[PDB]
Design a protein around this ligand. Structure first.
Ligand code: UPG
Ligand code: RAB
Ligand code: MG
Length: 295
């Protein structure tokens, strides 16, 4: 009724158990909450789901074919009855404040809250987020249009007004950055009021020919998405120009068989945020920082 948790899942029955248990330890009245698990035509997870359902109002949906996270999430958005929807990937965990920390902002007039993200390089549980080897923390406020440049959060961090009621769904033609496209669909396409909640955190758990072709899917979907959704300030429209620069440097390294920094994208976001801010750096300066971020 109040909140629908949507968990797309695929061949990770055991991570899905951790995510569900992190819903069960929510500091929240469970009579107001439903959970929708969507098996994207992988190994069955009935016994995993029938276990948690002894406490949560849980629904298991079985896809007719492997549809990608877009098609699986959409299946959840279609039946989610909550005024509000909270996405949770099957390999991530909520903190117990995930809803008590976001719902007051939504009831107050927000349409879309994202919380802080801890990039967890060790597996954790919901009540033990702050016992993990935290590699990076994504905590960028919404004051600069960073989200217009490229994505800086993840669906496990998002609680938002019923997208089925807005008629806003995931694009099934995108297997990567389908979330970036969806966030802009809500914020621009449907004028959702985006608000950052920095007092709540999730734990997000995260070959050359292999790598070059992989990042190329990302750049090409990033161009697609940029073209579909123009930036809502001129500075952000200018700072998009440094993304193909960052890609070119990534490709250069990959071709020389040199590895990039572990979280070079997340170091890149910090450079792009800087470039969007009060004293504006010259492009040669950003370029030098994109270097360090990637080295
Ligand atoms: O065919 C698939 C693959 C995955 N999933 C589920 O989708 C979620 C995300 O999959 P995962 O492999 O964990 O994604 P990440 O690599 O962590 O992130 C991807 O999905 C993110 C949102 O989770 C986007 O931010 C990024 O573009 C993209 O890299 C999880 O619930 C998966 O179980 C499906 O339902 N179907
Ligand atoms: N604009 C973009 N948005 C999201 N991801 C992007 C991206 N450009 C590349 N990537 C690639 O996807 C992974 C990011 O964590 C990593 O594989 C790599 O950084
Ligand atoms: Mg993941």
């Amino acid at each position: 009724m109040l909140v629908s948790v949507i968990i797309p899942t695929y061949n990770r029955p055991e991570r899905l158990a951790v995510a569900l248990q992190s819903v069960q330890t929510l500091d929240f009245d469970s009579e107001q909450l439903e959970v929708i698990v969507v098996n994207d035509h992988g190994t069955p997870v009935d016994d995993v789901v029938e276990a948690a359902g002894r406490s949560l109002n849980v629904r298991l949906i079985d896809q007719p074919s492997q549809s990608g996270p877009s098609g699986a999430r959409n299946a959840g958005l279609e039946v989610a009855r909550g005024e509000y929807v909270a996405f949770l990937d099957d390999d991530d965990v909520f903190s117990p404040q995930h809803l008590s920390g976001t719902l007051p902002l939504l009831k107050g007039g927000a349409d879309f809250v994202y919380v802080n993200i801890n990039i967890a390089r060790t597996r954790v549980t919901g009540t033990t987020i702050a016992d993990a080897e935290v590699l990076v923390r994504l905590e960028f406020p919404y004051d600069r249009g960073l989200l217009d440049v490229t994505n800086h959060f993840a669906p496990s961090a998002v609680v938002c007004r019923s997208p089925r009621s807005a008629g806003a769904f995931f694009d099934t033609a995108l297997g990567v950055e389908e979330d970036w496209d969806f966030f802009l669909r809500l914020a621009h396409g449907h004028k959702y009021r985006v608000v950052h909640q920095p007092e709540v955190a999730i734990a997000l758990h995260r070959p050359t020919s292999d790598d070059i072709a992989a990042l190329k899917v990302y750049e090409d979907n990033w161009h697609l998405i940029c073209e579909r959704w123009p930036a809502a300030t001129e500075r952000a429209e200018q700072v998009r120009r440094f993304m193909p620069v960052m890609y070119q440097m990534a490709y250069a390294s990959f071709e020389a068989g040199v590895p990039l920094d572990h979280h070079y994208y997340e170091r890149t976001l910090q450079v792009l945020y800087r470039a969007l801010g009060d004293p504006q750096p010259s492009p040669a300066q950003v370029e030098d920082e994109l270097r360090a971020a990637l080295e």
